[PDB]
């Protein structure tokens, strides 16, 4: 005496189902990354130049200590 009951889609329909590709760009420009790399290299070069000059001075100092002790 009841209505016919069956597995049916809801009245109206279903919400949209996405199927198309989604691969967003999400990236910097090439110039930006190249510039960051070059700037990092230059900063490292300057730091290493200072440190190596100081190291050469220290080496000279301890070499002179050896020279003083040699006789």
């Amino acid at each position: 005496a009841s209505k016919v009951k069956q597995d049916m889609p809801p009245p109206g329909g279903y919400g949209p189902i996405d199927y198309k590709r989604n691969l967003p760009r999400r990236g910097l420009s090439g110039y930006s990354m190249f510039a960051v790399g070059i700037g990092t290299l230059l900063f490292g070069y300057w730091s290493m130049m200072k440190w190596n000059r100081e190291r050469r001075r220290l080496q000279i100092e301890d070499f002179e200590a050896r020279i003083a002790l040699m006789p």
């Binding site: 919400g15 189902i17 996405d18 199927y19 198309k20 590709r21 989604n22 691969l23």
Partner: protein, 54 residues
């Protein structure tokens, strides 16, 4: 409604990877005429440009 994002993740892993393209591009190339004569069907046809779907 959620399977598309899984496809997107798989495609992020494989499609643009240069190792994947180096392993798959120009490997096992078959011509349309040879595919038709050798009895191929499905994607093995449609990969050669043959416009056929049952």
């Amino acid at each position: 409604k959620n399977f598309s994002f899984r496809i997107d993740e798989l495609e992020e892993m494989l499609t643009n990877n240069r190792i994947w393209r180096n392993r798959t591009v120009d490997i096992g190339v078959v011509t349309a005429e040879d595919a038709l004569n050798y009895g191929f069907s499905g994607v093995m046809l449609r990969g050669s440009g043959i416009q056929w779907d049952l």
